[PDB]
Each structure stands twice: as structure tokens, then as C-alpha cells.
PDB file of C-alpha atoms in Angstrom:
ATOM      1  CA  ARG A   7      31.539  -1.556 -48.676  1.00 21.71           C
ATOM      2  CA  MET A   8      32.838  -5.097 -50.084  1.00 20.60           C
ATOM      3  CA  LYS A   9      29.316  -5.292 -50.862  1.00 23.43           C
ATOM      4  CA  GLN A  10      29.098  -2.394 -52.470  1.00 24.27           C
ATOM      5  CA  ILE A  11      31.946  -3.186 -54.836  1.00 23.81           C
ATOM      6  CA  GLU A  12      30.182  -7.000 -55.948  1.00 24.51           C
ATOM      7  CA  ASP A  13      27.174  -4.670 -56.590  1.00 23.45           C
ATOM      8  CA  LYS A  14      28.743  -2.371 -59.173  1.00 19.70           C
ATOM      9  CA  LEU A  15      30.236  -5.588 -60.581  1.00 19.32           C
ATOM     10  CA  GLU A  16      26.756  -6.927 -60.828  1.00 19.39           C
ATOM     11  CA  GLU A  17      25.716  -3.455 -62.464  1.00 19.31           C
ATOM     12  CA  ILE A  18      28.537  -3.539 -65.097  1.00 16.90           C
ATOM     13  CA  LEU A  19      28.054  -7.554 -66.055  1.00 15.55           C
ATOM     14  CA  UNK A  20      23.684  -5.073 -66.518  1.00 16.11           C
ATOM     15  CA  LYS A  21      25.701  -2.522 -68.463  1.00 15.91           C
ATOM     16  CA  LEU A  22      27.423  -5.343 -70.388  1.00 20.19           C
ATOM     17  CA  UNK A  23      24.087  -7.441 -71.709  1.00 17.97           C
ATOM     18  CA  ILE A  24      25.985  -3.746 -75.013  1.00 17.71           C
ATOM     19  CA  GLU A  25      26.426  -7.332 -76.314  1.00 18.58           C
ATOM     20  CA  UNK A  26      21.693  -6.749 -77.104  1.00 18.93           C
ATOM     21  CA  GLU A  27      23.298  -3.514 -79.056  1.00 16.87           C
ATOM     22  CA  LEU A  28      26.023  -5.424 -80.972  1.00 15.36           C
ATOM     23  CA  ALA A  29      23.934  -8.193 -81.895  1.00 15.17           C
ATOM     24  CA  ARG A  30      20.921  -5.523 -83.266  1.00 14.05           C
ATOM     25  CA  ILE A  31      23.860  -3.857 -84.725  1.00 16.45           C
ATOM     26  CA  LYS A  32      25.044  -6.886 -86.376  1.00 14.84           C
ATOM     27  CA  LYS A  33      21.365  -7.680 -88.030  1.00 16.06           C
ATOM     28  CA  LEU A  34      21.379  -4.256 -89.340  1.00 13.85           C
ATOM     29  CA  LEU A  35      24.629  -4.725 -91.264  1.00  9.93           C
ATOM     30  CA  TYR A  36      23.437  -7.952 -92.538  1.00  9.43           C
ATOM     31  CA  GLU A  37      20.488  -6.175 -93.855  1.00  9.03           C
ATOM     32  CA  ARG A  38      22.250  -3.283 -95.329  1.00  9.88           C
TER      33      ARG A  38
ATOM     34  CA  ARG B   1      43.766  -1.315 -51.712  1.00 11.28           C
ATOM     35  CA  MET B   2      39.767  -0.736 -51.279  1.00 12.11           C
ATOM     36  CA  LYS B   3      39.497   2.422 -52.241  1.00 12.51           C
ATOM     37  CA  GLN B   4      41.669   2.144 -55.626  1.00 15.89           C
ATOM     38  CA  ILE B   5      39.182  -0.802 -56.365  1.00 14.77           C
ATOM     39  CA  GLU B   6      36.084   1.551 -55.700  1.00 15.10           C
ATOM     40  CA  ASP B   7      38.210   4.323 -58.101  1.00 12.41           C
ATOM     41  CA  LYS B   8      38.421   1.757 -60.863  1.00 11.07           C
ATOM     42  CA  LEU B   9      34.651   0.401 -60.600  1.00  8.43           C
ATOM     43  CA  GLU B  10      33.726   4.153 -61.131  1.00  8.01           C
ATOM     44  CA  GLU B  11      36.170   4.891 -64.503  1.00  7.18           C
ATOM     45  CA  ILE B  12      34.684   1.213 -65.741  1.00  2.94           C
ATOM     46  CA  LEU B  13      31.162   2.357 -65.147  1.00  2.45           C
ATOM     47  CA  UNK B  14      33.006   6.238 -67.534  1.00  6.07           C
ATOM     48  CA  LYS B  15      34.549   3.911 -69.601  1.00  3.89           C
ATOM     49  CA  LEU B  16      31.316   2.370 -71.098  1.00  2.82           C
ATOM     50  CA  UNK B  17      29.570   5.769 -71.901  1.00  5.15           C
ATOM     51  CA  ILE B  18      30.912   3.133 -75.417  1.00  4.71           C
ATOM     52  CA  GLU B  19      27.282   3.715 -75.596  1.00  3.72           C
ATOM     53  CA  UNK B  20      28.837   7.800 -77.929  1.00  2.00           C
ATOM     54  CA  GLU B  21      29.947   5.366 -80.194  1.00  2.00           C
ATOM     55  CA  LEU B  22      27.463   2.868 -79.995  1.00  4.26           C
ATOM     56  CA  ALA B  23      24.429   5.308 -80.155  1.00  5.12           C
ATOM     57  CA  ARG B  24      26.360   6.618 -83.718  1.00  4.53           C
ATOM     58  CA  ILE B  25      26.716   3.496 -85.068  1.00  6.62           C
ATOM     59  CA  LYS B  26      23.277   2.482 -84.600  1.00  5.25           C
ATOM     60  CA  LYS B  27      21.894   6.034 -85.756  1.00  4.25           C
ATOM     61  CA  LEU B  28      23.889   5.924 -89.046  1.00  4.60           C
ATOM     62  CA  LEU B  29      22.639   1.916 -89.617  1.00  6.19           C
ATOM     63  CA  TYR B  30      19.032   2.905 -89.482  1.00  6.52           C
ATOM     64  CA  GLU B  31      19.955   5.969 -92.073  1.00  4.82           C
ATOM     65  CA  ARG B  32      21.643   3.785 -94.357  1.00  5.69           C
TER      66      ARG B  32
ATOM     67  CA  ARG C  21      44.280 -10.865 -53.421  1.00  5.67           C
ATOM     68  CA  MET C  22      42.820  -7.385 -53.162  1.00  6.23           C
ATOM     69  CA  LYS C  23      45.910  -6.676 -55.097  1.00  5.33           C
ATOM     70  CA  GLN C  24      44.740  -9.683 -57.964  1.00  5.52           C
ATOM     71  CA  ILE C  25      41.255  -8.071 -58.126  1.00  9.53           C
ATOM     72  CA  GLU C  26      42.548  -4.435 -59.173  1.00 11.28           C
ATOM     73  CA  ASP C  27      44.787  -6.121 -61.570  1.00 13.14           C
ATOM     74  CA  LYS C  28      42.104  -7.499 -63.276  1.00 17.12           C
ATOM     75  CA  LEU C  29      39.999  -4.415 -63.317  1.00 16.04           C
ATOM     76  CA  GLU C  30      42.848  -2.370 -65.064  1.00 18.41           C
ATOM     77  CA  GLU C  31      42.867  -5.739 -67.317  1.00 24.13           C
ATOM     78  CA  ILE C  32      39.464  -4.481 -67.900  1.00 22.10           C
ATOM     79  CA  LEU C  33      39.728  -1.078 -68.000  1.00 23.69           C
ATOM     80  CA  UNK C  34      42.632  -2.388 -71.153  1.00 20.71           C
ATOM     81  CA  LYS C  35      40.044  -4.527 -73.031  1.00 20.85           C
ATOM     82  CA  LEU C  36      37.790  -1.508 -72.842  1.00 21.76           C
ATOM     83  CA  UNK C  37      40.307   0.440 -74.921  1.00 24.27           C
ATOM     84  CA  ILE C  38      37.045  -1.870 -77.288  1.00 25.56           C
ATOM     85  CA  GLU C  39      36.154   1.992 -77.868  1.00 24.00           C
ATOM     86  CA  UNK C  40      39.645   1.897 -80.500  1.00 24.84           C
ATOM     87  CA  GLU C  41      37.347  -0.825 -81.975  1.00 25.73           C
ATOM     88  CA  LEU C  42      34.179   0.982 -81.815  1.00 22.42           C
ATOM     89  CA  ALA C  43      35.865   4.395 -83.060  1.00 21.95           C
ATOM     90  CA  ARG C  44      37.345   2.524 -85.887  1.00 19.16           C
ATOM     91  CA  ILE C  45      33.613   0.605 -86.941  1.00 19.36           C
ATOM     92  CA  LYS C  46      32.230   3.849 -86.877  1.00 18.56           C
ATOM     93  CA  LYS C  47      34.792   5.823 -89.538  1.00 17.65           C
ATOM     94  CA  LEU C  48      34.324   2.713 -91.968  1.00 16.19           C
ATOM     95  CA  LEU C  49      30.516   3.262 -91.781  1.00 11.87           C
ATOM     96  CA  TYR C  50      30.869   6.853 -92.438  1.00 12.64           C
ATOM     97  CA  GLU C  51      32.891   5.747 -95.553  1.00 15.45           C
ATOM     98  CA  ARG C  52      30.366   3.141 -96.352  1.00 12.72           C
TER      99      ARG C  52
ATOM    100  CA  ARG D  20      32.394 -11.235 -50.306  1.00 12.64           C
ATOM    101  CA  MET D  21      36.292 -11.630 -51.874  1.00 13.96           C
ATOM    102  CA  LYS D  22      35.287 -15.071 -53.517  1.00 12.73           C
ATOM    103  CA  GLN D  23      32.219 -13.781 -55.006  1.00 14.29           C
ATOM    104  CA  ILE D  24      33.932 -10.455 -56.475  1.00 14.55           C
ATOM    105  CA  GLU D  25      36.908 -12.730 -57.871  1.00 14.56           C
ATOM    106  CA  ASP D  26      34.021 -14.907 -59.522  1.00 11.89           C
ATOM    107  CA  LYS D  27      32.532 -11.461 -60.945  1.00 10.65           C
ATOM    108  CA  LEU D  28      35.751 -10.446 -62.195  1.00  9.52           C
ATOM    109  CA  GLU D  29      36.064 -13.310 -64.245  1.00 13.77           C
ATOM    110  CA  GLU D  30      32.731 -13.793 -65.765  1.00 14.43           C
ATOM    111  CA  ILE D  31      33.438 -10.064 -67.178  1.00 11.66           C
ATOM    112  CA  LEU D  32      36.496 -10.537 -68.774  1.00 12.63           C
ATOM    113  CA  UNK D  33      33.834 -13.906 -70.443  1.00 14.93           C
ATOM    114  CA  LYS D  34      31.443 -10.946 -70.991  1.00 11.72           C
ATOM    115  CA  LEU D  35      33.959  -9.201 -72.853  1.00 12.75           C
ATOM    116  CA  UNK D  36      34.810 -12.411 -75.565  1.00  9.93           C
ATOM    117  CA  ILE D  37      31.910  -9.211 -77.447  1.00  9.00           C
ATOM    118  CA  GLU D  38      35.035  -9.500 -79.192  1.00  3.83           C
ATOM    119  CA  UNK D  39      32.021 -12.133 -81.420  1.00  2.00           C
ATOM    120  CA  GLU D  40      29.974  -9.638 -82.450  1.00  2.37           C
ATOM    121  CA  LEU D  41      32.654  -6.714 -83.009  1.00  2.00           C
ATOM    122  CA  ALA D  42      34.984  -9.384 -85.241  1.00  2.00           C
ATOM    123  CA  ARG D  43      32.124  -9.872 -87.169  1.00  2.00           C
ATOM    124  CA  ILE D  44      30.721  -6.549 -87.652  1.00  2.00           C
ATOM    125  CA  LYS D  45      34.638  -5.265 -88.753  1.00  2.88           C
ATOM    126  CA  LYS D  46      34.152  -8.256 -91.250  1.00  2.00           C
ATOM    127  CA  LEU D  47      30.852  -7.141 -92.634  1.00  3.25           C
ATOM    128  CA  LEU D  48      32.168  -3.837 -93.015  1.00  3.13           C
ATOM    129  CA  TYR D  49      35.603  -4.640 -94.886  1.00  2.00           C
ATOM    130  CA  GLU D  50      33.405  -6.558 -97.371  1.00  2.00           C
ATOM    131  CA  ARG D  51      31.133  -3.508 -97.858  1.00  2.00           C
TER     132      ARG D  51
END
């Protein structure tokens, strides 16, 4: 169970590569 | 404490559906 | 310690109200 | 497992400094 919690944290820390998206959104804004 | 931690992790992985706003922001930028 | 972990999850789930910011960023884009 | 979980939570609360991109996105939008 403690392992499963660790796994879910690793998936969130996966999910937060959001910060890919934000870099791309920033680039689009510089151009437009 | 373990059950409450598991509950919070699932709610965070809820909160990250952020991916609503970001999808809309990306669409708006494609169109501009 | 398990309590401290729960506390940090609650702070992150604080931090993610990011999704305030994203709603505001979306609104600015609709206007510009 | 407890130490590794604590390590991941601090790294996530690192990853959320996202608040780089979002600050820049907000500034760009104010100027447009």
C-alpha cells in the first residue's frame, strides 16, 4: 500500500511534465 | 492516515484533469 | 510523519487551485 | 518507503514552481 502511494506520486510527478504543455503554450504566445 | 493519504492522491490525479483549461488555451492559440 | 505527508498533499491540492490562474489566463485569451 | 514518499512530495512541491511558465504567460497576455 505504501508502495502504491509512492507509485501514484511518481505518476503525478509524469502528469506534471503539464510544464511540456506550458512551454509549448508560451512559445505559441511569443509568436502570436 | 493511510486511507486519507490514498484519498488525497486520487483527488490530486481529479484536480489535474487542469488538462479542461490547457486544452482550451491550446485551441485558442492555434486559432490566433 | 504520516500526518506530515498528508499535510504536504493538502498543500499541493492549495497549490493546484493553478487551475484560478488557468481560468484567468483563459479569460485574457478570449479577450485578446 | 516513508523516506522515498517524503522525497517525492518535496520534488512535486520543485515541479510546481510551473508558477516560471504561468508568470510569463500572464505577462505576455497583459501586454497583448
